[PDB]
Amino acid sequence: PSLEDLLFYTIAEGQEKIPVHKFITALKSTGLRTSDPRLKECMDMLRLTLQTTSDGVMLDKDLFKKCVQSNIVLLTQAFRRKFVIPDFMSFTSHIDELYESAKKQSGGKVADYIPQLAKFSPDLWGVSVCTADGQRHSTGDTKVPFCLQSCVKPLKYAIAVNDLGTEYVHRYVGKEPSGLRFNKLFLNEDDKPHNPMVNAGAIVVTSLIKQGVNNAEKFDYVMQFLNKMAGNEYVGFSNATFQSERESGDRNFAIGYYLKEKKCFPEGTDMVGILDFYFQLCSIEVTCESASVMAATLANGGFCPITGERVLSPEAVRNTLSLMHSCGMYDFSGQFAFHVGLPAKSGVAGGILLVVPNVMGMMCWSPPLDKMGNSVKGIHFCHDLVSLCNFHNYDNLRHFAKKLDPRREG
């Protein structure tokens, strides 16, 4: 016996050779993408042999085995229906009506704080899925770049905990939501910002990453880090949005100066420089496809699902997902933690970085904000998602009424 031939016969279906197109649509139907980095040796040796013998698209038992030999384990799990969502193509059908039912929520106002987020169309709306096994799906404006704005706050918090540890990082920032009037206090009773998901806490966290080095290297360090979270998909930077947050952030200068007064940074901090490094991290660009892999990295204990690389410590991922649970959606956070129960994080460009732990990561994006600062279609979509599947933090995996469980068979 051998898994290469075991896999060979499962696609061969009693015939003696496999057309390679029949193999890739079998592959593409599992939800994997042929561009997947863990499939690259196999696609290399398929493209080589559809050159080697350009006659017959067809593959004998060793022509198949020489091609899938080096990734065979991940193709067995794909074809033996062992991915976390086994019937991925029903799931994407469901994603599609969830996307298309959120698509007709009219309302919201595009953030017009700066000329750069007024430049985005209200009818843009994209959602991208990446599961803990690399299965992907997108619908809508998923390859359109936009800035994370404060979707970067969990990502930089995780990096800070990864290099520094929870105890150090939480000498300087709290771990609870403020209370839903204190939309306007900077510090809790211990003179620490309430948590890493508010501006005062984010600014303090930004002050802890890669100390002792200038703002050019730190930005690279976070970008090197954000690159691996996305399995090297698109992570960019829009200098346009940086310059306009550069002279329209009197609040962050207010927070920055208030924090310097009450001695909330580590010794030797250049506060004004930390604000610029902060403003830059907010102008970093992604698409929903790029970002959903970042989200799935958090869904997968800190391992990038499409590379197998250890990006974040499990301690870092854990803290980041518990604070996104409770403080991730501005004033809607408690309502969100009750009704949706998923770690999510919103940003003013229209992003919602969503994580369904142990299953998948997501990014939803539509620029029209509601009156608390959260993308309207994102909020609607994430409600309909939990109303349809047992993904809520406190749904039961055995008795879940008439919800769906994409993790299961029939």
Ligand X SMILES: O=C(Cc1cccnc1)Nc1nnc(NC2CCN(c3nnc(NC(=O)Cc4cccnc4)s3)CC2)s1
Residues making contact with ligand X (CB under 6 A): 181, 184-189
Of the two residues 89 and 185, which places its CB atom closer to ligand X in the complex? 185
Per the document, the length of the chain is: 410
Tell me if 67 sits within 8 A of 49, measured CB to CB: yes
Specify whether the CB–CB gap between 80 and 342 falls below 8 A.
Answer: no
Is 184 one of the binding residues for a second copy (CB under 8 A)?
no
Among 86, 140, 256, 357, binds a second copy (CB under 8 A): 357
Among 51, 52, 54, 106, binds a second copy (CB under 8 A): 106
Which residues between 389 and 408 bind a second copy (CB under 8 A)?
392-402
Q: Cβ 20 to a second copy, closest distance in Å?
A: 30
Largest CA distance in the chain: 77
**Eight-state DSSP code of residue 306:** T
Look-up of token digits 């930077």: 237
377, 141 contact by CB (below 8 A): no
**Least separation, in Å, of the C-beta of 184 and ligand X?**
4
Nearer to ligand X, 188 or 333 (CB): 188
CB-nearer residue toward ligand X: 194 or 318 = 194
**Residue closer to a second copy, measured from CB, 211 or 224:** 211
Q: Which is nearer to a second copy, 123 or 220 (CB)?
A: 123
Under the binding rule (CB under 8 A), the answer on residue 268 touching a second copy is no
Check the annotation: does 9 bind a ligand: no
Q: Are strands 109-110 and 58-59 parallel, antiparallel or unpaired?
A: unpaired
Q: How far apart are CA 260 and CA 257, in angstroms?
A: 5
The total of other beta-carbon atoms located within 10 Å of residue 19's CB is 14
Q: How far apart are CA 119 and CA 241, in angstroms?
A: 11
The whole-angstrom separation of Cα 304 and Cα 306 is 6
Site residues (vs a second copy, CB under 8 A): 100, 103-104, 106, 123, 132, 165, 167-168, 171, 175-182, 188-189, 300-303, 310, 313-315, 317-319, 321-323, 325-326, 333-335, 337-338, 341, 343, 357-358, 387, 392-402
Task: Detail the residues annotated as belonging to a binding site for substrate.
Answer: 150, 199, 245, 252, 278, 330, 348
